[PDB]
Design a protein around this ligand. Structure first.
Ligand SMILES: [Zn+2]
Length: 307
């Protein structure tokens, strides 16, 4: 509440608390962290990105988004923890410090702020945006089916009332197009990580196609390493693979898009658990989730700085 050291990372928070936290961190570490507004949500909420940088030009960067599906509360929670951890670990952990000395990290903690507020206000299990309009009484888009990556192919629904509605057209959702513009403008993203829950998967492209990416040996080996790393803290077991082979055909996804933009290190995380609590993960599992998931992200970041 009054500092990042006082903020309770072991509980779920509302939108206003997470936004206030962003200000606390920026005030506490003005030299390392910048808050960027890359857009406004459908219902006009600021869309915020935290930039961690040690200086430089337009340094190669890591993108990280969390909470694009609003009900996956473990992701926004992890996302606050990560932001603190970046400030803690800089100059303490030789490895994280070599990363920030050369690369920037862009972290979007609440990708889908309207959906998030709605999970607090009215429906805990809401996952879509809150865009209206058309020939429908149904609200919102699945923002992870809205990307220009096999948009409107099988693996996404053309029904507005669907939980997997893709939207009217690729990048209809302002929460998506804001990211698109942001990353295309920057032009120097090397990794792109989207954070989801649940089922304990690490996934690389594609969802939308059975085509093998050209980088599949490397991405596979990276995913293997990062899952090994993650499991080392608490024994938490992930599976890894391409989206389409591991789950099922899915179109308009984040990672397919970023990989098609030439961002090679494009991974999605589905965090704990495997279905005991599902989206309603106990607050007592926040910090352990955040701590292990860090070891997996770190591993990918290392690989990135290195290739
Ligand atoms: Zn999700």
């Amino acid at each position: 509440a009054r500092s990042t050291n006082t903020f309770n990372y072991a509980t779920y928070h509302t939108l206003d608390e997470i936004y206030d936290f962003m200000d606390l961190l920026v005030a506490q570490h003005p030299e390392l962290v910048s808050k960027l507004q890359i857009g406004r949500s459908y219902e006009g909420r600021p869309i915020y990105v935290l930039k961690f940088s040690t200086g430089g030009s337009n340094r190669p960067a890591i993108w990280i988004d969390l909470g694009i599906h609003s009900r996956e509360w473990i992701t926004q929670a992890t996302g606050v923890w990560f932001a603190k951890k970046f400030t803690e670990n800089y100059g303490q952990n030789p490895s994280f410090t070599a990363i920030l000395d050369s690369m920037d990290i862009f972290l979007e903690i609440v990708t889908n702020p309207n959906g998030f507020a709605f999970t607090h206000s009215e429906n805990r299990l809401w996952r879509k945006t809150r865009s209206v309009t058309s020939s429908s009484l149904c609200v919102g888009v699945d923002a992870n089916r809205n990307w220009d990556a096999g948009f409107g192919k099988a693996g996404a629904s053309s029904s507005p009332c669907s939980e997997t509605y893709h939207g009217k057209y690729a990048n209809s959702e302002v929460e998506v197009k804001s990211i698109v513009d942001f990353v295309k403008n920057h032009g120097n993203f090397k990794a792109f990580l989207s954070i989801h829950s649940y089922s304990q998967l690490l996934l690389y492209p594609y969802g939308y196609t059975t085509q093998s990416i050209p980088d599949k040996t490397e991405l596979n080996q990276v995913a293997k390493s990062a899952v090994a790393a993650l499991k080392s803290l608490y024994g938490t077991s992930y599976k890894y693979g391409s989206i389409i082979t591991t789950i099922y055909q899915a179109s308009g996804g984040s990672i397919d898009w970023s990989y098609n933009q030439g961002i090679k290190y494009s991974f999605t995380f589905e965090l704990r658990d495997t279905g005991r609590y599902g989206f309603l993960l106990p607050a007592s599992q926040i910090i352990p989730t955040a701590q292990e998931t860090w070891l997996g992200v770190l591993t990918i970041m290392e690989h990135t700085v290195n290739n």
